[PDB]
């Protein structure tokens, strides 16, 4: 539980301080190696609790560090730790084994690249535990080192190459946007580049310091102490006057623990117990798998449940969901689409035949447009190929680019629609389908266009009968504090101000979309309870009364499922796209919970 860190030691000295610490019980969870391959420099964290035997080896040429590694992995250890310092030819190595049980590593120092680290590793996601960017920088080297990602855990690592260099403080600030993203390593080379790694995993409260003299560093540390915060990793780089660091503190040593939280009741099932237990059991084995935090599940009969489970796989510092917590909806947002123009057909404010631009009063640059109908939008029919001409939905930065405004302002719904008229269709209307977001945005803006009533108000006083169904809204800042958290890796350029250059969460404008024009089409949230509930009388899939089929939703920080089949409704709701594979989910959606329901009859 005890820390104990040295920085700027000899080889000499770094064997004395580990054979010592080593010997009163502590373990190494950090080397770095840096400076002149002749006199290399070492930083070290010891943390004093038990564990598997260990070997480490410092001032070693690629030879010994090969010979070393090789001889280590042939009795059953793992490559925990790998530092390199010097030019390619001359290069010295250091490095951690532990006597570990791990399915896969992965480990090559001899890259010329980073990103050719993906042939080494074939097809397994891994998590990157070891890198130093060595070599010079006209002949640059990489050792890096990756464990299997067992846990499917949420990592990024940007590198920089010969040819590009990562802005540190912008891609700090970036990663760290994202809610519990924080760093876990701050890599860093002879010619003072940080490669930095982040998790959003939590060691409790953390800091960082980068671009340290040992001076600066140990008053840092000091500070650090005081506010109990200790050493979990800290990296050298550069020789002599030019020696600096970088260091991560966290409150614990290492990540919290998830743990197991179940909420809502089955109620309306022949063995309410007897189906909690298998349905429990199949979502908790997906969620330990695919590492997925946060999930809802829910059955309906006629627009009434009959069952809620509401399920948290997480550490301590997230919201344990309740069955009326709301997720992003993704695509599934479509549904109240399709029901509201369902509602102006049959209320004969609208025609399934009605031409929409001719309506609008817009002159399309195809004539084909001038074709497109109600039908043809609901139907993804109306000529919009986005494998062909890209997809508009996540095309509002561009959008907003190319106004007479020139980026100043944000792209609206109307804005989209007018820079897509002005394009040529992809196909003629009719022909075939092909799955659109634009087609339910236009229709969207043709829902506001005939009532005069924005569409989240038409929603609330026509279509949701009282349903909490809500705009996700866009703004990172909306969400900091949310019971639900909409999980991705992911960032991007920002659309809502298309002038900053800062990169924004995939899930806050990072996906290219700006929800608030986005309503008709996947920027809506609510319950899967809500979900199973509206599909009772409402087209899960095209348009009407309840029909059996399914509707499925992809965002950055979501996927939804629902599904009419037979007498009940049932949703499931996840609070990320991230699991394993498409495979994984489809397991679950397609077989699991179906057989789940087959096996575990409604009451009689
Ligand atoms: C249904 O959708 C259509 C298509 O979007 C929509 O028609 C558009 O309405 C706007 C008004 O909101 C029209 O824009 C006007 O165009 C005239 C010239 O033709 C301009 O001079 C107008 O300027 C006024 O508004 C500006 C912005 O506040 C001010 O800068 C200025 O001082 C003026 O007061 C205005 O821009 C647009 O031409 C049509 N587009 C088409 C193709 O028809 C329609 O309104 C929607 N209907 C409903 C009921 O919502
Ligand atoms: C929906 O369809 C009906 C029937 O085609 C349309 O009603 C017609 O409207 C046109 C234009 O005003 C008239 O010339 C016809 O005489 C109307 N027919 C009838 C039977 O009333 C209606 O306009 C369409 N709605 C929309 C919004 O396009």
Redesign the pocket.
């Known amino acids: 539980s005890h820390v104990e860190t040295y920085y700027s030691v000899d080889g000499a000295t770094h064997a004395e301080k580990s054979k010592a610490l080593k010997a009163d019980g502590y373990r190494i969870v950090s080397l770095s190696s840096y400076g002149s391959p002749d006199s290399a420099n070492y930083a070290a964290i010891w943390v004093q609790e038990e564990g598997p035997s260990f070997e480490i080896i410092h001032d070693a040429d690629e030879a010994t560090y090969n010979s070393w590694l090789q001889t280590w992995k042939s009795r059953g250890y793992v490559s925990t730790q790998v530092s390199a310092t010097g030019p390619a030819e001359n290069a010295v190595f250091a490095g951690v084994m532990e006597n570990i049980n791990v399915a896969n590593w992965f480990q090559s120092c001899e890259l010329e690249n980073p990103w050719a680290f993906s042939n080494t590793t074939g097809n397994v996601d891994v998590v990157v535990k070891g890198f130093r960017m060595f070599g010079t920088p006209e002949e640059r080297r990489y050792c890096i080192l990756g464990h299997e990602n067992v846990g499917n855990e949420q990592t990024t690592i940007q590198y920089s190459t010969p040819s590009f260099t990562v802005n540190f403080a912008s891609t700090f600030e970036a990663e760290t946007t994202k809610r519990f993203w924080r760093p876990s390593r701050l890599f860093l080379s002879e010619d003072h580049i940080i490669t930095p790694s982040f998790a959003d995993t939590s060691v409790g409260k953390w800091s960082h310091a980068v671009d340290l003299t040992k001076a600066e560093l140990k008053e840092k540390i000091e500070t650090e102490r005081a506010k109990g915060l200790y050493p979990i990793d800290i990296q050298g780089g550069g020789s002599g006057s030019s020696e600096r660091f970088t260091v991560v503190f966290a409150e614990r040593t290492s990540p919290k623990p998830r743990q197991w939280n179940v909420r809502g009741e089955i109620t309306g099932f022949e063995d309410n117990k007897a189906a909690e237990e298998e349905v429990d059991s199949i979502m908790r084995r997906f969620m330990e798998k695919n590492g997925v935090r946060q999930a809802q599940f829910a059955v309906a009969l006629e627009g009434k449940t009959i069952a809620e489970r509401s399920y948290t796989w997480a550490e301590d510092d997230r919201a344990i969901v309740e069955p009326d917590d709301i997720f992003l909806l993704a695509s599934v947002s479509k549904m109240f689409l399709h029901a509201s123009i369902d509602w102006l057909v049959s209320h004969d404010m609208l025609n399934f035949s009605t031409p929409v631009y001719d309506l609008?009063?817009?002159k399309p640059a195809d004539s084909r447009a001038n074709d497109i109908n109600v039908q043809h939008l609901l139907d993804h029919s109306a000529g919009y190929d986005r494998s062909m001409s890209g997809d508009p939905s996540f095309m509002f930065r561009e959008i907003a680019q190319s106004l007479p405004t020139k980026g100043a302002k944000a792209a609206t719904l109307?804005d989209v629609?007018?820079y897509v008229v002005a394009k040529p269709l992809d196909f003629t209307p009719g022909d075939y389908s092909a799955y659109s977001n634009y087609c339910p945005m236009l229709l969207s803006?043709v829902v506001?266009?005939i009532t005069?009533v924005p569409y989240l108000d038409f929603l609330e006083k026509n279509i949701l009968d009282g349903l909490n169904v809500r705009l996700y809204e866009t703004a990172a800042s909306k969400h900091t504090e949310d019971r639900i958290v909409q999980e991705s890796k992911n960032t991007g350029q920002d659309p809502v101000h298309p002038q900053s250059a800062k990169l924004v969460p995939g899930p806050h404008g990072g996906d290219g979309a700006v929800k608030e024009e986005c309503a008709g089409t996947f920027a809506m949230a609510a319950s899967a309870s809500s979900l199973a509930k509206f599909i009772g009388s409402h087209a899960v899939w095209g348009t009407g009364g309840r029909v059996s089929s399914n509707r499925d939703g992809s965002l950055s920080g979501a996927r939804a499922y629902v599904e009419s089949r037979g007498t009940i409704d049932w949703a499931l709701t996840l609070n990320t796209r991230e699991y394993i594979s498409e495979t994984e989910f489809d397991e679950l959606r397609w077989y699991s919970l179906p057989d789940f329901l087959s096996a575990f009859p409604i009451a009689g």
């Open positions: 609008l009063g817009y109307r629609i007018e803006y506001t266009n005069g």
